[PDB]
């Protein structure tokens, strides 16, 4: 059936690393690629894009019986912010970013990205705000850019941010992170076909 908005679990094994068990919440199935899902995994800071039925690293995929658990939220969406947060690896950051959107499915979570790490993160920002840790200040087309190792990175534009229509989400073929590009900004080494 339809796994969007569902709790899921599956095995993960990339290459010769030991098999791990991943558990997460499916946020969305990408319209321009219905094989591609966006998932918030438990304890993972970044939103992942995985072809959950096609990826050979994914095994034993199941939906779980378990269920998925305003004025300030409305204000934050689209704002440039300064976020004081601690990452999975213990690094203590004070970073400038932007709040992209309230996340689908998980209703106190927000899509957020940072100028130092322009991928899609997801955090409970209204809690960080109360803690005093947050300060408020093409889709479907292929894309590429040249990397420093003399090769092209290739991907597809998968989402246009409603709060900021010049901001797009890009899925690259080589990676499960979701890359966030604001096209008005000097990020002009992107080529769209």
UniProtKB/Swiss-Prot annotation:
Record's protein name? Spindlin-3
Function comment: Exhibits H3K4me3-binding activity.
Named from the GO MF annotations, one term is: histone H3K4me3 reader activity
Positions of the UniProt region annotated as Tudor-like domain 3: 139-184
Q: Name one GO biological process term.
A: gamete generation
Where is the region Histone H3K4me3 and H3R8me2a binding? Answer: 86, 175-177
Subunit details: Interacts with C11orf84/SPINDOC.
Q: What organism is recorded for this protein?
A: Homo sapiens (Human)
Region Tudor-like domain 1, annotated ranges: 4-53
| Site features described as Histone H3K4me3 and H3R8me2a binding, chain residue numbers | 117, 124, 128
Please state the gene responsible for encoding this protein. Answer: SPIN3
């Amino acid at each position: 059936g339809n796994i969007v908005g569902c709790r899921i679990q599956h095995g993960w094994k990339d290459g010769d690393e030991p098999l791990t068990q991943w558990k997460g919440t499916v946020l969305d199935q990408v319209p321009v690629n219905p094989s591609l899902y966006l998932i918030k995994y438990d304890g993972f800071d970044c939103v992942y894009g995985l072809e959950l039925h096609r990826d050979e690293r994914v095994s034993s995929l199941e939906v779980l019986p378990n269920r998925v658990a305003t004025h300030l939220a409305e204000i934050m969406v689209g704002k440039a912010v300064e976020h004081i947060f601690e990452t999975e690896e213990g690094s203590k950051n004070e970073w400038r970013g932007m709040v992209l959107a309230q996340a689908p499915v998980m209703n106190t979570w927000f899509y957020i990205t940072y100028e130092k790490d322009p991928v899609l993160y997801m955090y409970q920002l209204l809690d960080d705000y109360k803690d005093g840790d947050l300060r408020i200040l093409l889709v479907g087309k292929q894309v590429e850019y040249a990397k420093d190792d003399g090769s092209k990175r290739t991907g597809m534009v998968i989402h246009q941010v409603e709060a900021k229509p010049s901001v797009y989400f890009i899925k690259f073929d080589d990676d499960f992170h979701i890359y966030v590009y604001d096209l008005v900004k000097t990020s002009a080494e992107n080529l769209y076909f």
